[PDB]
Design an enzyme around this catalytic site. Structure first.
Site, PDB file in Angstrom:
ATOM      1  CB  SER A   1     137.633  57.158  78.338  1.00 33.74           C
ATOM      2  OG  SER A   1     137.373  55.768  78.194  1.00 33.74           O
TER       3      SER A   1
ATOM      4  CD  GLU B   1     140.057  61.275  87.853  1.00 36.29           C
ATOM      5  OE1 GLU B   1     139.673  61.926  86.865  1.00 36.29           O
ATOM      6  OE2 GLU B   1     140.749  60.214  87.747  1.00 36.29           O
TER       7      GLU B   1
ATOM      8  CB  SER C   1     140.546  56.182  84.244  1.00 34.56           C
ATOM      9  OG  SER C   1     139.612  57.284  84.339  1.00 34.56           O
TER      10      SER C   1
ATOM     11  CE  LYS D   1     139.633  56.910  87.981  1.00 38.56           C
ATOM     12  NZ  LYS D   1     138.592  56.976  86.918  1.00 38.56           N
TER      13      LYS D   1
ATOM     14  CB  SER E   1     136.671  53.754  85.698  1.00 32.11           C
ATOM     15  OG  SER E   1     137.921  54.221  85.235  1.00 32.11           O
TER      16      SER E   1
HETATM   17  B1  LIG Z   1     138.978  57.856  83.125  1.00 36.14           B
HETATM   18  O1  LIG Z   1     140.068  58.404  82.300  1.00 36.14           O
HETATM   19  O2  LIG Z   1     138.337  56.837  82.392  1.00 36.14           O
HETATM   20  C1  LIG Z   1     137.075  56.388  82.734  1.00 36.14           C
HETATM   21  C2  LIG Z   1     136.516  55.365  81.787  1.00 36.14           C
HETATM   22  C3  LIG Z   1     137.415  54.141  81.617  1.00 36.14           C
HETATM   23  O3  LIG Z   1     137.951  53.632  82.611  1.00 36.14           O
HETATM   24  O4  LIG Z   1     137.542  53.653  80.459  1.00 36.14           O
HETATM   25  C4  LIG Z   1     136.103  57.465  83.089  1.00 36.14           C
HETATM   26  C5  LIG Z   1     136.688  58.461  84.096  1.00 36.14           C
HETATM   27  C6  LIG Z   1     137.934  58.999  83.541  1.00 36.14           C
HETATM   28  N1  LIG Z   1     137.738  59.945  82.506  1.00 36.14           N
HETATM   29  C7  LIG Z   1     137.107  61.117  82.633  1.00 36.14           C
HETATM   30  O5  LIG Z   1     136.781  61.605  83.695  1.00 36.14           O
HETATM   31  C8  LIG Z   1     136.763  61.826  81.314  1.00 36.14           C
HETATM   32  C9  LIG Z   1     137.306  63.238  81.276  1.00 36.14           C
HETATM   33  C10 LIG Z   1     137.472  64.283  82.245  1.00 36.14           C
HETATM   34  C11 LIG Z   1     138.053  65.475  81.625  1.00 36.14           C
HETATM   35  C12 LIG Z   1     138.284  65.290  80.255  1.00 36.14           C
HETATM   36  S1  LIG Z   1     137.817  63.776  79.769  1.00 36.14           S
END
Ligand SMILES: *[B@@]1([O])O[C]([C]C([O])=O)[C][C][C]1[N]C(=O)[C]C1=[C][C]=[C]S1
Ligand SMILES: [Cl-]
Length: 262
Positions: free
Chosen positions: A211, A140, A44, A47, A104
């Site tokens: 994450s 995503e 994330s 982004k 996020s």
């Molecule tokens: B992103 O990478 O991180 C987010 C949380 C943060 O900002 O700490 C949540 C959305 C994103 N991650 C995911 O969608 C989790 C996964 C999707 C496929 C494997 S893990």
């Protein structure tokens, strides 16, 4: 210097995973680098580049951020903290940018990606800035799989620190657009356990977390320490087991180690 390297190496060993750090200190143009040329799944933290690409596009389309985007059930993915509240309505591109950066939200990220022409367009924007390491391959939620050895949706800590510096403190974006990016990142709600947790309470931080699979736990930040020139810090971390748990504490520890004695 070598002390900091040793402390990062010890943190990495204790953690069991693979740690990547790049600090740029704009006080003296110095860096601290640890695996800073290795690739890591951005998750994330990508982004920021997607929001920046929309901000760039808005420089030649002054009413772009007000443009309305429909949110439907078909848009929902795995993590929709803001978008789920707006199903069957519209959100502006500004609102989507804020939701992606500050909560996020994955739907918001998908709408930013789609708007600017897809992952290859976000990547081409990175190239236009002079970042030849960044790659956004997927949308995503699949861009977060973070499989070891997989170069999809990766960058290096060095590249991302240099790019984040350019976006937030340099001249990649017009003054209004840069200010908006910094405002959005300072208003992040998701970062208090990550880089922020390894810095003094008085310091001001704009950051973006991520994450992902393999316990991938990331944060990228612009930092204004009390009465000092700003810093840029990337802390990326990933683990050997597919279902490894998040380790935001490791990012906090890395931040502490590289800013100690500033
Ligand atoms: B992103 O990478 O991180 C987010 C949380 C943060 O900002 O700490 C949540 C959305 C994103 N991650 C995911 O969608 C989790 C996964 C999707 C496929 C494997 S893990
Ligand atoms: Cl403190």
């Amino acid at each position: 210097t070598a002390d900091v390297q040793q402390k990062l190496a010890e943190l990495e060993r204790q953690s069991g995973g693979r740690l990547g750090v790049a600090l740029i200190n704009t006080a003296d143009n110095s860096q601290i680098l640890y695996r800073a040329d290795e690739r890591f799944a951005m998750c994330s933290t990508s982004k920021v580049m997607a929001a920046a690409a929309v901000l760039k596009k808005s420089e030649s389309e002054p009413n772009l951020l007000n443009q309305r985007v429909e949110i439907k059930k078909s848009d929902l993915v795995n993590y929709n903290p803001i978008a789920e509240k707006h199903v069957n309505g519209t959100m502006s591109l500004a609102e989507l940018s804020a939701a992606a950066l500050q909560y996020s939200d994955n739907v918001a990220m998908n709408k930013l990606i789609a708007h600017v022409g897809g992952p290859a367009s976000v990547t081409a924007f990175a190239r236009q800035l002079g970042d030849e390491t960044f790659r956004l391959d997927r949308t995503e939620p699949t861009l977060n799989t973070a499989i070891p050895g997989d170069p999809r949706d990766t960058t290096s800590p060095r590249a991302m620190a240099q790019t984040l510096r350019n976006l937030t403190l340099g001249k990649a974006l017009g003054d209004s657009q840069r200010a908006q990016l910094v405002t959005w990142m300072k208003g992040n709600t998701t970062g208090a356990a990550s880089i922020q947790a390894g810095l003094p309470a008085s310091w001001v931080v704009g950051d973006k977390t991520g994450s992902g699979g393999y316990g991938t736990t990331n944060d990228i930040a612009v930092i204004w320490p009390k009465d000092r020139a700003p810093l840029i810090l990337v802390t990326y971390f990933t683990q050997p087991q597919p279902k490894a748990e998040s380790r935001r504490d490791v990012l906090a520890s890395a931040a502490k180690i590289v800013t100690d004695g500033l």
